[PDB]
Design an enzyme around this catalytic site. Structure first.
Site, PDB file in Angstrom:
ATOM      1  CB  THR A  19       6.919  -2.050   4.907  1.00 45.41           C
ATOM      2  OG1 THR A  19       7.653  -2.360   6.065  1.00 45.41           O
ATOM      3  CG2 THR A  19       8.018  -1.502   3.821  1.00 45.41           C
ATOM      4  CG  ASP A  59       1.019  13.633  11.330  1.00 44.27           C
ATOM      5  OD1 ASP A  59       1.196  12.472  11.002  1.00 44.27           O
ATOM      6  OD2 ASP A  59       1.257  14.702  10.763  1.00 44.27           O
ATOM      7  CB  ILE A  62      -0.905   0.023   1.218  1.00 43.39           C
ATOM      8  CG1 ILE A  62      -1.884  -1.271   1.026  1.00 43.39           C
ATOM      9  CG2 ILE A  62      -1.598   1.184   1.328  1.00 43.39           C
ATOM     10  CD1 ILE A  62      -2.671  -1.545   2.282  1.00 43.39           C
ATOM     11  N   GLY A  63       2.033   1.146   0.823  1.00 44.46           N
ATOM     12  CA  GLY A  63       3.021   2.344   0.862  1.00 44.46           C
ATOM     13  C   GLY A  63       4.267   1.909   1.972  1.00 44.46           C
TER      14      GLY A  63
END
Ligand SMILES: CN1CCC([C@@](C)(O)c2ccc3cnc(Nc4ccc(-n5cccn5)cc4F)cc3n2)CC1
EC number: 2.7.11.1
Lengths: 148, 290
Positions: free
Chosen positions: B16, B125, B9-10
């Site tokens: 990870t 965030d 996914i990223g």
């Protein structure tokens, strides 16, 4: 109200809790905690020391529920106290992150991480509550002061 | 071993992230692997903070942490699976949302945010990448790696919180302490993206440019509006830009009611910023809103 005064209470608390540890000194926990704070400061992991009255109270809150009366060596007490300290830095510390190295005194890293996850499972709720509930903060603060 | 990884996914400093399948129950989940092998960096520290907070933040509009596994020299955080984040959603749909999707997304964000604040947690965030979007229209507040519990008095919190574009003027001016107000400013900034073309309202190059872009649009706070502004640690005199500048062209998808809620979120003086709970009571969210 002093950091030294409250670190001394925590040390005296640990000596009374851990009755099997005949040659543990109430200054030994204080030396272990101050050593870490200094080390992180001098390696520029933080601008200011983490060890404050409030954070010592937070650390005691974890210690009193996590630290077994049946701890069998000064080494084992140091490993559990530095596990509770690592989680204190990680939950209440003003820096985004903190390295493991100063908190690891075991050769078995798997045992350190399992105890992190074990303490979070036990304490995650009280970690939020001591912040959310001022009355509970005062109770814990009082209890620590009554350990001398 | 318990989870079959389907695809990436990223990945960053965070770690990870994979779409995965529970081998036992065949349920689709999101896995974050966190490496424990680098004793000389602090990545694990931030993951354990997220774990402590998410264990205590169970709400349909906060990303659900299902489990935490420790196998090999790795930590695996098991989350509910989400179809995408708001960043990919904006790219998917030409930054163009129906006014009711604008309304649905802000609503869910404020409910998740309101839940955090009432549980004594600051997110710190908020940005489109940390809003997870499902194809059924659900939104979840995610990524509590920068979040913290509050209530114990302290000298200060970190001012190295929120990415520059979503950071409020008090924190840009280096305020030692901030309240739940910090997240409500970020919510305002995201509302503006939803209600225009998915583009950041205040894309500053640095702190100085960031404050100029905020004041250029909203006007420069006066001593009357914000009496403590000049006493802030990194305060410096800015031009006095007028408070007369129209928001109609900045958020063309909002009527007067939406624009009123946006101005209650983008108050420079943190003490004047609407709370999540008040925001959910705003006419923008009533059944009687045009
Ligand atoms: C920045 N920060 C990093 C940490 C991440 C994390 C580990 O907390 C988390 C937790 C649950 C998650 C559930 N679902 C998905 N799904 C998902 C998302 C995006 C895309 N995408 C963006 C562009 C292209 N694809 C694709 C997808 F499938 C991610 C999650 N991430 C949240 C965000």
């Amino acid at each position: 109200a002093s950091t030294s005064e409250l670190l001394r209470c925590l040390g005296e608390f640990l000596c009374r809790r851990c009755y099997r540890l005949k040659h543990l000194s109430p200054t030994d926990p204080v030396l272990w905690l101050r050593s870490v704070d200094r080390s992180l400061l001098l390696q520029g992991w933080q601008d200011q020391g983490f060890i404050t009255p409030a954070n010592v109270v937070f650390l005691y809150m974890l210690c009193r529920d996590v630290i077994s009366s049946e701890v069998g060596s000064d080494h084992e007490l140091q490993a559990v106290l530095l596990t509770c300290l690592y989680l204190s830095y990680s939950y209440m510390g003003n820096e985004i992150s903190y390295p493991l190295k100063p908190f690891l005194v075991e050769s078995c890293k798997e045992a350190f991480w399992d105890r992190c996850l074990s303490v979070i499972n036990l304490m995650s709720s009280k970690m939020l509550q001591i912040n959310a509930d001022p009355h509970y903060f005062t109770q814990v603060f009082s209890d620590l002061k009554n350990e001398s | 071993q318990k989870y079959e990884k389907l695809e990436k996914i990223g990945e960053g400093t965070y770690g990870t992230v994979f779409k995965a399948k529970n081998r036992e129950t065949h349920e689709i989940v999101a896995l974050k692997r966190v490496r424990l092998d680098d004793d000389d960096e602090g990545v694990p520290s931030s993951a354990l903070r997220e774990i402590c907070l998410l264990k205590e933040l169970k709400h349909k509009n906060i990303v659900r942490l299902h489990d935490v596994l420790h196998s090999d020299k790795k930590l695996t955080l098991v989350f509910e699976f989400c179809d995408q984040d708001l960043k990919k959603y904006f790219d998917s749909c030409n930054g163009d949302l129906d006014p009711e999707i604008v309304k649905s997304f802000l609503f869910q964000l404020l409910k998740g945010l309101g839940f955090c604040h009432s549980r004594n947690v600051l997110h710190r965030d908020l940005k489109p990448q940390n809003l997870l979007i499902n194809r059924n229209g659900e939104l979840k507040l995610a990524d509590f790696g920068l979040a913290r519990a509050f209530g114990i008095p302290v000298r200060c919190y970190s001012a190295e919180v929120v990415t520059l574009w979503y950071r409020p003027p008090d924190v840009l001016f280096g305020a030692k302490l901030y309240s739940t107000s910090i997240d409500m400013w970020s919510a305002g900034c995201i509302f503006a993206e939803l209600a225009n073309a998915g583009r950041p309202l205040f894309p500053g190059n640095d702190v100085d440019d960031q404050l100029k872009r905020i004041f250029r649009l909203l006007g420069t706070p006066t001593e009357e509006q914000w009496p403590s502004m000049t006493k802030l640690p990194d305060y410096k005199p800015y031009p006095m830009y007028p408070a007369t500048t129209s928001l109609v062209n900045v958020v063309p998808k909002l009527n007067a009611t939406g624009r009123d809620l946006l101005q209650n979120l983008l108050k420079c003086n943190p003490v004047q910023r609407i709370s999540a709970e008040e925001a959910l009571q705003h006419p923008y969210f009533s059944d009687f809103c045009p």
